[PDB]
Amino acid sequence: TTTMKISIEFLEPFRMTKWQESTRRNKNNKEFVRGQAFARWHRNKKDNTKGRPYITGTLLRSAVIRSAENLLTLSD
RNA sequence: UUGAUGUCACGGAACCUUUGUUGUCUUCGACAUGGGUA
Questions:
Q1: What distance in Å separates the CA atoms of residue A37 and residue A26, rounded to the nearest whole number?
Q2: Strand B, CB < 7 A, residues 10-69 of A
Q3: Dist CA A13 CA A25 (whole Å)
Q4: What angle do CA A50, A53, A56 make, to 5 degrees?
Q5: Euclidean distance between CA atoms A50 and A48, whole angstroms
């Protein structure tokens, strides 16, 4: 395998989801499903708010697939 | 700290209603103080 280092630079304030317990991270929780397009909060330990933000590779993948659809539309 | 053949969340105006307002002559006279003498 070969590794491609990337970085993302924001030009505007970005949105982030409210952290939720693992019993609630499923399709029947409206709050979790609505936040799936935002950034996430990670707690270092589940009983403390201490943590830091992150972005999933899945979301970037989805955005890239949409972009690829548009580019291939332009090139026929 | 994701999981992958499927994410329109740039898919959603913190928006809407509310009088810093009501009442009042820039006037006017008797009052302070605590003993003293048998």
A1: 15
A2: 12, 15, 33-34, 36-38, 40, 42, 52, 54, 56-59, 61-62, 65-66
A3: 25
A4: 135
A5: 5
Asked whether A32 and A24 are in contact (CB, 8 A), the reply is yes
Cβ–Cβ under 8 Å, residues A56 and A35: no
CB-CB contact of A43 with A19 (8 Å): yes
Local structure of A48: helix, strand or coil: coil
SS3 A31: helix
Residue listed under structure tokens 């982030």: A16
Report residue A15 as tokens.
Answer: 């949105």
- Structure determined via: cryo-EM
